[PDB]
Amino acid sequence: EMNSVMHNDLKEVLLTEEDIQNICKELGAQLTKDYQGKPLVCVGILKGSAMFMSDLIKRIDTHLSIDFMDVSSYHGGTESTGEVQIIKDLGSSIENKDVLIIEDILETGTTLKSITELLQSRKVNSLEIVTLLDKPNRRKADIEAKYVGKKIPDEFVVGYGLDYRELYRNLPYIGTLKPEVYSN
């Protein structure tokens, strides 16, 4: 049931629902092996990462707890400064935990690198990133993910947590927007 007019706002589909499920299976197996019997805490940065987190955690077959952060980056221009406001911190301690940050997309890396530095400072046993999407040529900060679902060119993408003006996060697939939708 795919009748909504929203679907016609897409220039192309980069990942189908089935592709994304398959990505979760593959990453889940690897994370199971890596985190078997470890005190794993999966951390989602709100809002969009929650959808991928949900699907991914299902395929991690070892004990884990979950937690969430809500942050707001400062900008100079429309580029992030690295200064990041904590709207909601983690609700539990991560000292001596194995932390896995779960991300929908890795781009400039600037916000993520601050998050990462705050969490390292809390004496975690380890810290890694899983990201569904990676735009490797947009990287500004010195950061890369250990686990990556799909590398993509620098297109404007929506779906499966990724929004344009708060919409489209509910699509079960990921695709590119028509330039007519976001142009001026």
* R_g over Cα of the chain: 17
Distances from the Cα of 71 to the Cα of 24, 91, 183, angstroms: 25, 14, 27
Distances from the Cα of 149 to the Cα of 66, 106, 155, angstroms: 20, 11, 16
Do the beta carbons of residue 82 and residue 115 sit within 8 Å?
no
Active site residue 107: yes
Q: Which of 1, 107, 117, 128 is catalytic?
A: 107
Tell me which residue of 62, 149, 68 sits closest to 106, measured CA to CA. Answer: 149
Backbone angles phi, psi at 26, to 5 degrees: -65, -50
State the residue for tokens 């890694």: 128
Amino acid at 23: I
Residues with Cβ within 8 Å of 138's Cβ and at least 6 positions away in sequence, in order, are 107, 108, 154
Q: Which CATH class is domain 1-184?
A: alpha beta
State which H helix or E strand residue 67 sits in: strand 64-76
DSSP state of 152: -
Structure-determination approach: X-ray
Q: Report the Cα 91 to chain-centroid distance in Å.
A: 19
Do the beta carbons of residue 112 and residue 131 sit within 8 Å?
no
Per domain, the residue ranges of the chain are 1-184
Do the beta carbons of residue 159 and residue 175 sit within 8 Å?
yes
CA–CA separation, 21 vs 16, rounded Å? Answer: 9
Residue 159 is encoded by which pair of tokens? Answer: 């779906």
Distances from the Cα of 155 to the Cα of 7, 125, 174, 176, 179, angstroms: 17, 36, 11, 6, 10
Resolution in A: 2.5
In the chain, which ranges are continuous DSSP H helix? 17-35, 49-57, 110-120, 179-182
